[PDB]
From a paper:
M-Sec-induced TNT formation is accompanied by actin cytoskeleton remodeling, which requires the association with RalA, a small GTPase, and its downstream effector, the exocyst complex. We identified a conserved, positively charged surface in the C-terminal half that is essential for M-Sec interaction with active RalA and promotion of TNT formation by extending out the plasma membrane.
To obtain high resolution M-Sec structural information that might provide insight into the mechanism of membrane protrusion formation, we determined the crystal structure of the N-terminally truncated (residues 1–66) M-Sec at 3.0 Å resolution. Although we could also crystallize the full-length M-Sec, the N-terminal 66 residues are disordered and the corresponding electron density could not be observed. This domain structure is similar to that of subunits of multi-subunit membrane tethering complexes (Exo70, Exo8416, Sec618, and Sec1529 of the exocyst complex, Tip20 and Dsl1 of the Dsl1 complex, Cog4 of the COG complex, and Vps53 and Vps54 of the GARP complex) and cargo-binding domains of myosin V-family proteins. Particularly, there is a remarkable resemblance between the C-terminal halves of M-Sec and yeast Sec618 (Cα r.m.s.d of 3.0 Å over 278 amino acids), as expected from their high sequence similarity. The domain arrangement of M-Sec (domain A: Helix 1–4, domain B: Helix5–9, domain C: Helix9–13, domain D: Helix13–16) is similar to that of Exo70 and adopts a straight rod-like conformation. In addition, M-Sec has an extra C-terminal domain (domain E: Helix 17–20), which is conserved among tethering subunits and cargo-binding domains of myosin V 18202123303132. The calculated electrostatic surface potential of M-Sec revealed a positively charged surface that covers both domains D and E, where conserved lysine and arginine residues are widely distributed and exposed to solvent. To test this possibility, we introduced two sets of mutations that would decrease the overall positive charge in domains D and E: One set is a quadruple mutation K531A/R532A/R533A/K537A, and the other is a double mutation K470A/K474A. These results suggest that the positively charged surface of domains D and E is responsible for the interaction with RalA, which is required for subsequent extension of the plasma membrane.
Numbering used by the authors: 67 to 199, 205 to 650
Amino acid sequence: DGPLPTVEELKEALEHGRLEVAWQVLALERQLEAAAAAGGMSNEELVWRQSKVEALYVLLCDQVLGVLRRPLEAAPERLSQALAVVSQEELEDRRASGGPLAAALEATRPRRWLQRWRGVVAEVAAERLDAQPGRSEAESRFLHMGRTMKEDLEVVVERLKPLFPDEFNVVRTYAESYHYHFASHLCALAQFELCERDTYLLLLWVQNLYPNDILNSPKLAQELQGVGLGSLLPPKQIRLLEAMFLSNEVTSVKQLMARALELESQRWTQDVAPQSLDGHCHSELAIDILQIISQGQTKAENITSDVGMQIKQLLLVELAALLRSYQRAFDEFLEKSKLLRNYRVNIMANINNCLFFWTSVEQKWQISHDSLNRLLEPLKDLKAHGFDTLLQSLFLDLKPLFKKFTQTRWANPVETLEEIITTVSSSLPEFSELQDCFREELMETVHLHLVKEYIIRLCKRRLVLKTAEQQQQLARHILANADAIQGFCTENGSTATWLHRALPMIAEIIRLQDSSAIKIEVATYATWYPDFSKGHLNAILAIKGNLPSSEVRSIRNILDINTGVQEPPRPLFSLIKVT
């Protein structure tokens, strides 16, 4: 075997790549250091010998790096490792102890070859991350980048991790060399007034795609946990990016909802017949609105959980906004358009929407029920004004045929009432084009109106009965009617159970002839419907013609309808004021 005598030979060996001889190249330098410190040696010779050393050492370098740029060369990469350490520690040798250099020599010795390597790893991490791979130039850049880095670090943990010794940290050096390059190309875009779409794609990337899809979800996963890389953009700048993105998107859905509303507004305006699933659908506004919201919420869920929650609490306010300005536009629709062929039809479509809002917002937001109801307020107002507007026409046709109980001094109830049932049942049809929930919600309204109206008639102090027999006859009448109403309404979709004992129980107060009895049906009747007051008790006893100072007694009951335990009176007598 060797060594190699002439420096010519050695140079020739380096030139043919062979690095057994790398050790000799250092030996020379060491020898020079020797021959110098022997004193006896020309300066004119020192310079010669040193120029030759450092020239050889340049060559050696370019061979080692030449190998390590593309570690797919062979197995004398162990050689290149060995040398990229011999010189690395020789650096430490000639610190300040080998550090005296006789002049004419020119110090060269912190050579820092491992650092050179890092420079190359980094320069290759930047040749590859920068190759030419569209959603955007930016998003295509990020794509190609993330891909390339996942790929390449996968290669390093797969193949370069067993070849490199522990001193170098192959892995840390590679991931960090790529990582920092990524973060550089991002820091570059941060120095810009960027588009909204751009803000979202880079925020997504930093916050979600990078650390999950690349750093964490692969097989790389396990390794880089050790590395502990940071963000791409810096913390403060990321939080700033959030803060502006929110305002972007929140503004997007604000404007978009606004436009949805405007457009449906004109559908009404334009006498568009709504389309019918089973009851009418203008759920156009319903689902189109909730879709705007859901997609915004996804977009801000697709960064952080916290970006998400922030945009939720932030969207509540603009939803409130919309609903409010919706009620207003529907109301204005009511007030003006009316001749329109699909005025009532439209109304029903809109009323229908409330079901979907209730249903979807109860599941989506998970808010307190007073917060829920606080948001949902102007939908009741819309459904209120809705119902009031469709019904209004039948409540009028019904206005005289109730006077006719008073007009005929209750001569024949059942005929008058049958006229009313006819006049109401001739309205059942179109109200079937209305959501089932609201169907029965409206039936309670009609039911209630029939009962209120009846009790308003009996309380009009416009019939006094002289003798028990006709009070019993009147009772039989009332009861007949109460069974007609309760039956028909229940049978047509009302579930207003509370109303059922309204009329029958009054018939009983009319019919009952003995004092105590009347006191007891009064007690019980205040129990069902406790908004029943002395006012009504009077107007009812007015139709009694006997009993004059048992009035005082029967009334001193009602005198304390005061609960204090629970106050849940569904309005019945609240709504019937007679003085």
